[model samples]
Target: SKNSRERMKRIEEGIKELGSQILKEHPVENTQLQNEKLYLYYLQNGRDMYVDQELDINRLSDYDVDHIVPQSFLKDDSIDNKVLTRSDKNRGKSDNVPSEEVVKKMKNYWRQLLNAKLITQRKFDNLTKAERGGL
Candidate 1:
């Protein structure tokens, strides 16, 4: 369907814009290169659907890297602060902290790392604090 193809192209354009914004905040890497790398990473890890396929800019790019804390308030766009997520989910969470259940789930990830001694308790504390808005 031509319309469907057009819609996917528009979505990919939006994704590229978001990637460019991320690179603007963290200028440690090249923009276009990082965008491709980020998308490849997501395709393998977060999305897991396009892993075997070659890079196709025309493919339905529906994900974006989102801030754990809204970029506006946090003014922190470090790579550590970002997560690969679906565009719809990213929009839904705009400028808002996770819900209680989601927060608990997020904590569980860090907690496991802490338990495994992969991350220090202090790091866990800092992460949870910022995630919970320092409350």
Candidate 2:
């Protein structure tokens, strides 16, 4: 019982340390509401390059990394095709090409990323090809 209790105490301490580290590294306005923004800013290329809506990182367990086109058809798993999406939206779009609106947005997003120098020209070309079915 003492060993178990000590283990739990260590786990709790680990949790606190991780929480503190995240707060110090991310520094968001509101930890809960800005979870998505935090991930976008900190993890995903340091910019909200391809967001469709306001994001929250703390609740990202409810989200999914989506594929713009059906993987079954493309057989490609490149980062160019990956997008951060809400779980509901990802499920609704399951194994299908994303909507034209989403496609346009992603294309624009790629362009913005290219302009921002976050992505290279070759990467942008590949993304454009994937979006245009060249891949």
Candidate 3:
């Protein structure tokens, strides 16, 4: 949050977790490259997901990726901090969601993921730092 070093570390660690998950779940495919691109794209070109005003996702022309956790809500820049949702699905998932419910769902999802063992610690650690961080 303070400098490129901190931001870079978070992103790198997050991608390692995310990419490893992608590989374990979809063993035959090359998802790391594509998913990583999507993460960077959304990080740079936000789907305007956490807008302050009421938003109509139907007005969007494309299915741009969005972070599950708003960057504003983030204490770190981790790709594991997100999920792929349609641009249309973005506004529907508002920051307006009651804090209580949001925390519950986040914890539930995290547990389900670990229970599924969808990724490996080593595979995640192998991922490189995302190139778009400085921008």
Candidate 4:
């Protein structure tokens, strides 16, 4: 019915298709989404997502986008949990949550994005949580 379709459309639009199982079906789309988040982060902070160092245009090839919560655990591929950092600094990071220092460095920036609704409340809460604290 149109009524059911309207409700479904409302929910999907509310989440902006972030919950649309994009990763498994189309990893490329997810990467683009993650890159957009990184671009916005750079615009806000003028610094790398994890480290305090300023981003270098010449060194753009060395940057990476990694999950704030390990995909192995959280399995979340949304831009909310993705962040950009240098590959040399983040190589082989397995199942590690962002450190308090890392979180602190970007908390204010994240808050701004949050207030602007560029990122969702769930992502902000996840980033600010004390720990993964289990599944």
TM-score of candidate 1 to 2 decimals: 0.42
Error of 4 at 95 (Å): 2.5
Worst 10 residues of 2 by lDDT: 30-39
Model 2: clashing residue pairs? 35-56, 35-57, 36-56, 36-57
Per-residue lDDT tens digits for candidate 3, residues 1-135, read 224444444444543544444323323222333444333332222223223222223433344444444556644344544433344243343452223332333433333333334322321221111211210
Q: Provide TM-scores for the models.
A: 0.42, 0.47, 0.32, 0.56
Question: lDDT values of the candidates?
Answer: 0.42, 0.47, 0.35, 0.53
Model 1 per-residue lDDT tens digits across residues 1-135:
114344334334443533434223332222333453353332222232211222233343655555555667676664444444444252234545433444554676556544544334554554465355652
Q: List model 4 lDDT by residue over 1-135, tens digit each.
A: 123344333333433433333223322322332344334333323356566576664465567767767887887775667766765354223556666656667788667656645457887777666344422
Candidate 4 CA-lDDT value? 0.53
Show model 1 residue runs off by greater than 4 Å. 1-33, 36-60, 88-93, 113-135
**Shift of residue 30 alpha carbon in model 3, Å:** 4.6
What TM value does model 2 have? 0.47
Give the candidates in order of lDDT, highest first.
4, 2, 1, 3
Report the number of the highest-lDDT candidate. 4
Best by TM-score: 4
Superposed Cα deviation of residue 58, candidate 2 (Å): 0.6
Which stretches in model 2 have alpha-carbon errors above 4 Å? 1-51, 88-95, 117-135
Q: Output the TM-score of candidate 3.
A: 0.32
Cα lDDT of model 2 by residue, 30-127, tens digit: 23323332333332333233445644656566666665455777765544455455553632345456544445666776665556444456656644
